[PDB]
Design a protein around this nucleic acid. Structure first.
Lengths: 150, 220, 138
RNA sequence: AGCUGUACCGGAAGGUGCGGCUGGAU
RNA sequence: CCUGGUCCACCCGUGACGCUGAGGCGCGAAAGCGUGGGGAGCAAACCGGAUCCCGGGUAGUCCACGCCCUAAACGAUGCGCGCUAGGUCUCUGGGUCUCCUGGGGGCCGAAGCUAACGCGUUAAGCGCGCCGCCUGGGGAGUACGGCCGCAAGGC
RNA sequence: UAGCGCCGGCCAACUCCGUGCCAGCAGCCGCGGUAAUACGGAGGGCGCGAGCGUUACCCGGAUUCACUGGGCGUAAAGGGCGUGUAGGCGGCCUGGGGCGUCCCAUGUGAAAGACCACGGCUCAACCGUGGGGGAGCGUGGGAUACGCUCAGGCUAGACG
């Protein structure tokens, strides 16, 4: 029903008495290419378990995107921590002009025409979170009209 | 009005304890205490009652939560005069968000109580009897009344939203409506359907709970 | 010394809307009234009123919000997400007709002080005049 | 404990004056 | 005795007389200098005593003029103005007096901010004005040039 | 007539032998002491091809001089502190001027070049014809919200 993209696996270590204990964290996007996106960060002792947990979190965390002509209604600038994402609508036949992380997020959203930029810190986790937040913060003409006049 | 005033409904807390967000409910200050405006009390009460009656007739369940001292008994008695579940002894962190893991413990409770309703306890020497017993009393102390929930509720009823802040947060997270008997020192915004009144004054708690439960009964 | 009144007014509105106040007060002037009428027309605020506070003339502004949100943080959706001042004292920004910005693909507005009075970006483009770029609002 | 501004060292893994700081424990 | 800053009450008077401010001009702990005095005690240097201590001890610490003008000169936080929940303690005014209203000094904490720690009406929040400064570490606050100083040295 | 570079990650493309911190590679991270997908040959593979590479210089990435578009509690960075000259910035109401500002018209923004349309070379490069657009500046009118200037008033800043 949904598609998955595995952004990154990382192996984080911690000290114990004469040894190192490892843990694997996975960043996963779940989408339908119609305007439903989920991002999940999953920690587990084993890689497949991390993938499973990340997928689970992604499913239990869904966002709807207001697509018109497979593009964004209006440009956005969002800061999360030290990182900034800039999204800008583009005419059809432009393609997804984005880094690996934003492209992975946006493809599964059904977005096909967008101009992006990353500023400040470029931590994939934070960029991904910022992208998700920006997507959560998009409004249409109708929504704005209802809010203002109704 | 005319029922609340004798029940000590409109007696809040001192000038020190008040949450400023509650300022829209305070009528005036007297003798260093805050008095709740009874008009808005009645109005919000009407609104919440309309909600409750519609929900009850629709067939929704309300989980009653009073974990204060003087609230325990009233919560118990008022819950018994309904099919509603209740939690009065202690709120375990994650009864709702972690409902799955709690359900296992519920199943363990029922199977253990069935074991004591079985002639097989002639095995498991007195020591094993003692251990499983101690377990059973511990369980019945905590997980009684919460038993009825085969699934998630449709609302929540809190005595003191600040005392049970955890439960309020859990309800918020799972998109479950919130009803509370908030007072001066509580945040209005976290509570969907609010009854601005007293969380002390056993009389007030008794009156509010009795009226609500009677309404549930007449609407069932 | 209060250097810039208009920036002060915008900041007052922003600060009030941040803590979900119902009304706010701003020292009254003609130009502020013009900005406020423009805002009220485009339905960013409930509306303003001319009041008096201890002898001094004031503007009482009534703000607007969305419905009560569900889930965690039930604070209502803002109607004014963002309000800036473009041309501050010390750096004045003037624009011709051709240089008028489009804000949020038109979902937002830009207030201009044209020679024909205070107009939105839309009205200024329609008439065919430019002037001092006051603020953007969305 | 440490650090620092000046001043001096013909026993300088540096020391001592005079004063300050916590970026140090009662 | 002479003198500076400041707070409150009446809301009496002038009528925007305002804020910041590169240079300049003043002030600037301790240490250090020149010309005189003074020196109880304490103590760089130095003289001894056992193996970081204990006895002595000049400068200095003191005063009067003229220099020097640097610091972990710190809240490591430029100055001014307006806005945004409160709780508590403490100093100092006013009132109708354990309740209000001013101005300072601390702690907890809304919203918000921050990489985090934390700040949070005494902002590190939301804004406007002016000033100084920053652009990888070491070489190095070094060299060289210039301006100050008796010298140390400072910029 | 078919070169030429590359095959650890960035970055498309993997195995076997030879030496074994030696010979060597490398733009950065770093590879080489028993396989070493990184050194040297071979099979295969990848990219572009009458070209493929390497140096040198410029812009980009670099938001790493930040007007668009950054900062100064502890990461580099608030002057030791005042008082102040030049400068920068400046409350409310009314009226005049029209400097800034905006608008209309016109002149100049040569040719070639950039952009669009058509066409000539068997296509293209190249070229031709026509159409535009263009920051700025001169001239003649209009506008007066804001900034500026004057003229008057006001008390909320500031003084007494």
């Amino acid at each position: 029903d949904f598609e998955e993209k595995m952004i990154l696996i990382r192996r984080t270590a911690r000290m114990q008495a004469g040894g190192r204990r490892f843990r694997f964290g996975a960043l996963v996007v779940v989408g339908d290419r119609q305007g439903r996106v989920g991002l999940g960060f999953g920690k587990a002792p084993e890689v497949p378990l991390a993938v499973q947990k990340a997928g689970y979190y992604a499913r239990r965390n869904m966002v709807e995107v207001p697509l018109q002509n497979g593009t964004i209604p209006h440009e956005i600038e969002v800061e999360f921590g030290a990182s900034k994402i800039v999204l800008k609508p583009a005419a059809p036949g432009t393609g997804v002009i984005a880094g690996a992380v934003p492209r992975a997020i946006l493809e599964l959203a059904g977005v096909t025409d967008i101009l992006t930029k990353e500023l400040g810190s470029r931590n994939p986790i934070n960029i991904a979170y910022a992208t998700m937040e920006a997507l959560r913060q998009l409004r249409t003409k109708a929504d704005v009209e209802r809010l203002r006049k109704g | 009005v005319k029922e609340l005033l004798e029940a000590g409904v409109h007696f809040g807390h001192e000038r020190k304890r008040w949450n400023p967000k509650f300022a829209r409910y305070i009528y005036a200050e007297r003798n260093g205490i805050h008095i709740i405006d009874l008009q808005k009390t009645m109005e919000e009460l009407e609104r919440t009652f309309r909600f409750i009656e519609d929900l009850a007739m629709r067939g929704g369940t309300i989980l009653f939560v009073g974990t204060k001292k003087q609230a325990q008994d009233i919560v118990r008695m008022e819950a018994e005069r309904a099919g509603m579940p209740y939690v009065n002894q202690r709120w375990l962190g994650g009864m709702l968000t972690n409902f799955k893991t709690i359900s296992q413990r519920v199943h363990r409770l029922e199977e253990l109580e069935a074991l004591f309703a079985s002639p097989e306890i002639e095995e498991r020497p007195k020591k094993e009897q003692v251990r499983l017993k101690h377990e059973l009393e511990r369980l019945q102390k905590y997980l009684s009344g919460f038993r009825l929930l085969k699934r998630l509720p449709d609302a929540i009823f809190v005595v003191d939203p600040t005392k049970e802040a955890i439960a309020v947060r859990e309800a918020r997270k799972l998109f479950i409506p919130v009803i509370a008997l908030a007072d001066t020192d509580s945040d209005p915004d976290l509570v969907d359907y609010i009854i601005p009144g007293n969380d002390d004054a056993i009389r007030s708690i008794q009156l509010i709970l009795s009226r609500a439960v009677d309404l549930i009964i007449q609407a069932r | 010394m209060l250097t810039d009144p208009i920036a002060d007014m915008l900041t007052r509105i922003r600060n009030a809307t941040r803590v979900y106040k119902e009304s706010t007060d701003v020292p009254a002037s003609r130009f502020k009234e013009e900005i406020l009428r423009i805002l009220a027309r485009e339905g960013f605020i409930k509306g303003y009123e001319r009041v008096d506070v201890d002898g001094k003339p004031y503007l009482r502004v009534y703000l607007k919000y969305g419905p009560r949100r569900q889930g965690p943080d039930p604070r209502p959706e803002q109607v004014i997400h963002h309000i800036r001042r473009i041309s501050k004292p010390g750096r004045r920004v003037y624009v011709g007709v051709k240089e008028i910005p489009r804000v949020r693909r038109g979902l937002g507005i830009a207030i201009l002080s044209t020679s024909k009075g205070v107009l939105t970006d839309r009205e200024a483009r329609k008439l065919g005049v430019g002037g001092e770029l006051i603020c953007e609002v969305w």
